[PDB]
Amino acid sequence: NNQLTVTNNSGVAQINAKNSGLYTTVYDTKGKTTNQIQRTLSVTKAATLGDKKFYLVGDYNTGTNYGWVKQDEVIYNTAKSPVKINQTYNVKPGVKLHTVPWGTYNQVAGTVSGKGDQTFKATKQQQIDKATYLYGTVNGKSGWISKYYLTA
């Protein structure tokens, strides 16, 4: 009959406001509603059950699995494994930090403030499709900033 195919995948995603909910099991007939929309979530696995297609989504900073979500009900993006780095960067005031790479408005960690260019000390970096996001600290606030907003 219908067989299930669960391969490993690492693609971060954000559930659209129009969704069938979070399926507890790929075999479930109905998805359970979730307020977890327009947020960057971590993808750990991709599944195919006949004509259905899901992504296993969880919280990025804890690894807590939330559930399975229809692939077509999310904006997906590949996520290369993060790497350790040590580099200081110049960042202008007004630039937003996010709690996760490629975060949404629900995921702001703070804003850069001061007189003239502030100092951002990076510790990790991560590639999301083609964009590189760097995790570091500016004036006590820790967070993710895209390389576009940083200058060497």
Curated annotation (Swiss-Prot):
Post-translational modification, as annotated: Undergoes proteolytic processing to generate the two extracellular lytic enzymes, probably at the septal region on the cell surface.
Domain GW: 5-79, 81-152
Intracellular or extracellular location(s): Secreted
Top-level taxon: Bacteria
Record remark: domains: The GW domains are responsible for directing the proteins to the septal region.
Protein's job: Endohydrolysis of the di-N-acetylchitobiosyl unit in high-mannose glycopeptides and glycoproteins containing the -[(Man)5(GlcNAc)2]-Asn structure. One N-acetyl-D-glucosamine residue remains attached to the protein; the rest of the oligosaccharide is released intact. Cleaves the peptidoglycan connecting the daughter cells at the end of the cell division cycle, resulting in the separation of the two newly divided cells. Acts as an autolysin in penicillin-induced lysis. As a bacterial surface-associated protein, mediates attachment to polystyrene surfaces, contributing to biofilm formation.
Family classification: In the N-terminal section; belongs to the N-acetylmuramoyl-L-alanine amidase 2 family.
Subunit-structure text: Oligomer; forms a ring structure at the cell surface which is important for efficient partitioning of daughter cells after cell division.
The protein, known as: Bifunctional autolysin
The species this protein was found in: Staphylococcus epidermidis
